[PDB]
Amino acid sequence: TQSHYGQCGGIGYSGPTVCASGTTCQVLNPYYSQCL
Ligand SMILES: *[C@H]1O[C@H](CO)[C@@H](O)[C@H](O)[C@@H]1O[C@H]1O[C@H](CO)[C@@H](O)[C@H](O)[C@@H]1O
Q: Glycosylation annotated at which residues?
């Protein structure tokens, strides 16, 4: 899973998108979504 404060869903982001249990994937910007 993605770490806390990590990107959880960018458009074209091939890395860890699934937030860790206890973190919310908050889309902050078009490509930047962060596990908060
Ligand atoms: C958490 O770790 C992931 C890799 O294991 C990264 O992909 C994430 O973006 C996230 O890293 C960022 O946030 C953490 C918060 O603890 C910082 O420690 C990292 O340096 C980085 O800024």
A: 1, 3, 14
Q: From atom 2 of ligand 1, which residue's Cα is the shortest distance away?
A: 3
Tokens encoding 18: 């699934």
Measured between alpha carbons, how far apart are the two ends of the chain, in Å?
13
- Break the chain into its structural domains and give their ranges: 1-36
Query: Which approach determined this entry?
Result: NMR
Query: What single letter denotes the amino acid at residue 30?
Result: P
State the Cα–Cα distance between residues 29 and 1, nearest whole angstrom. 20
CB atoms within 10 A of CB 34: 20
